Write a protein that binds this DNA or RNA. Structure first.
Ligand SMILES: *[C@@H](C)[C@@H](O)CCCOCCOC(=O)CCCC[C@@H]1SC[C@@H]2NC(=O)N[C@@H]21
Lengths: 228, 214
RNA sequence: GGCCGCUCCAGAAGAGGGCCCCCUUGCCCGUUAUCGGGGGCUAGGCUCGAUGUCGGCC
């Protein structure tokens, strides 16, 4: 009796392109449910996209996807689908599948009582590009309370994600790797910083290790203080 | 004509054991057809309450819901550590269903002023044609802070972007980057680059600055 | 004046339609689907009624 919803099909597509999402259900019958797609743009709220009742075939859609998106269901597979055509950048989001249980004794559908893990959809005309990595160097001017700050600017990559470590994982305390920002160019950028004792700067080596799997890039940048 | 759901506040800080209330106002009557969801970062929402006040199966009894007209409230009677999360209201009186924008419940701690650092663009970056100037606000609380860029004493607008971490898992602070992006041409037209920070933990604004070429 | 009627005029004429609110769906109901009852409005703009300030007949 364990309800499960397993989404798949997300990925990266160009504006104008298409993707088909799948939601494989177990633990209940699709014909005893209303199935939904709800999306969440990065850092934003929840937006309903489409619903279907597999028992009747009835469907409904958010105005902004009508004509572009089709929700469907295959009860022989207990799977619901979202066919997404004419995709655009503003459709970039995590797409959740969700279920409302049917209750024959009730008189209308109630809330979204179970949600799957989500599948990420990114729509962008940007081309895959590894980051340019630049030092954020500590200066003698910049020592506060015996502590120095340094870091790496990880600029102009696509798509997400990058990971950053320091000294191959040996340095974890005081590290802050900021969320990426989508620049107007369509490329992403972020910084990773760490605070360290200022007296250490002459006798410690600080290296940021930047990984961008989509471009198969691993870059190590030594960050050292500048003199006068 | 859709029904809008307006949630306030966008975030609130509390401590374990506090009574927490989150509110959601429907733009018009939804009777009692309101649900409440909890969502943790990187995770799917979970249903807590439906029909305004009915606890969904398995949800702990410290969660409760109430209605006063178009105002709907979720109350956590004694906040637990697993309750720091974002909470969403939703109406289903009328299709399309609509959600509030969410309320993030964050961890209260003592005020902490940011340590501020400014970074000139690297020569490596200048060679490529761009100049990112980074201002760092490290380990501060609360989240509210104002970062202002000044170039040769001229207040900048529209050419910077901020990024803020989630609350640190160990000390509950925030850190923030503000990045000023100029072309190399523009960056060479000016000398003084200054980041000015206003925050409750600081008696007066802190300014870190440098002179290009020094 | 009388009878017949709405095919044109009048709005002097009330139902349909639409909007809002209360009741945790509350006689009975309810399309795998949000009702019912009550309350607050919208009139001459469409339909269907009704009417005469209308038309026909005598
Ligand atoms: C018919 C029962 C209904 O129209 C009359 C309501 C009874 O109350 C008297 C007041 O009348 C109104 O104010 C109703 C306005 C007429 C609405 C009709 S519906 C079709 C047409 N389209 C539109 O927008 N108005 C008119």
């Amino acid at each position: 009796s364990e309800v499960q919803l397993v989404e798949s099909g997300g990925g990266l597509v160009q504006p104008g392109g298409s993707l088909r999402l799948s939601c494989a259900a177990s633990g209940f019958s699709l014909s005893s449910s209303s199935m939904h797609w709800v999306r969440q743009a990065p850092g934003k709220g929840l937006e309903w996209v489409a619903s279907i009742s597999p028992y009747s075939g009835s469907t409904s859609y958010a105005d902004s996807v009508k004509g572009r998106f089709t929700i469907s269901a295959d009860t022989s597979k207990n799977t619901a689908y979202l066919q997404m055509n004419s995709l655009r950048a503003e459709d970039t989001a995590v797409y959740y599948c969700a279920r409302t249980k049917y209750h024959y004794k009730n008189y209308y559908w109630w809330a979204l009582d179970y949600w799957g893990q989500g599948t990420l959809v990114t729509v962008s005309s940007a081309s895959t590009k590894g980051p340019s990595v630049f030092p954020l160097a500590p200066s003698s001017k910049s020592t506060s309370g015996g502590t120095a700050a340094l870091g790496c600017l990880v600029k102009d990559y696509f798509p997400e994600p990058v990971t950053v470590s320091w000294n191959s994982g040996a340095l974890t305390s005081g590290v802050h790797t900021f969320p990426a920002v989508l620049q107007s160019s369509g490329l992403y950028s972020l910084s990773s910083v760490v605070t360290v004792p200022s007296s250490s700067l002459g006798t410690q080596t600080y290296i940021c290790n930047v990984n961008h799997k989509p471009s198969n890039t691993k870059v190590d940048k030594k960050v050292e203080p500048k003199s006068c | 004509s859709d029904i809008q759901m307006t949630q306030s506040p966008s975030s609130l800080s509390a401590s374990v054991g506090d009574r927490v209330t989150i509110t959601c106002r429907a733009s018009q009557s939804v009777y009692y057809s309101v649900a409440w969801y909890q969502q943790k970062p990187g995770k799917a929402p979970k249903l807590l309450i439906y029909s305004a006040s009915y606890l969904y199966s398995g949800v702990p009894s410290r969660f409760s819901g109430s209605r006063s007209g178009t105002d709907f409230t979720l109350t956590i009677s004694s906040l637990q550590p697993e309750d720091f999360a974002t909470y969403y209201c939703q109406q289903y009186r009328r299709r399309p269903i609509t959600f509030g924008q969410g309320t993030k419940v964050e961890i209260k701690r003592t005020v902490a002023a940011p340590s501020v650092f400014i970074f000139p663009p690297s020569d490596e970056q200048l060679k490529s044609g761009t100049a990112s100037v980074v201002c760092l606000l490290n380990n501060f609380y609360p989240r509210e802070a104002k970062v202002q860029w000044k170039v040769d004493n001229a207040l900048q607008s529209g050419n910077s972007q901020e990024s803020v971490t989630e609350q640190d898992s160990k000390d509950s602070t925030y850190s923030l980057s503000s990045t000023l992006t100029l072309s190399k041409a523009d960056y060479e037209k000016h000398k003084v680059y200054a980041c000015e920070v206003t925050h409750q933990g600081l008696s007066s604004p802190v300014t870190k600055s440098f002179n290009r070429g020094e």
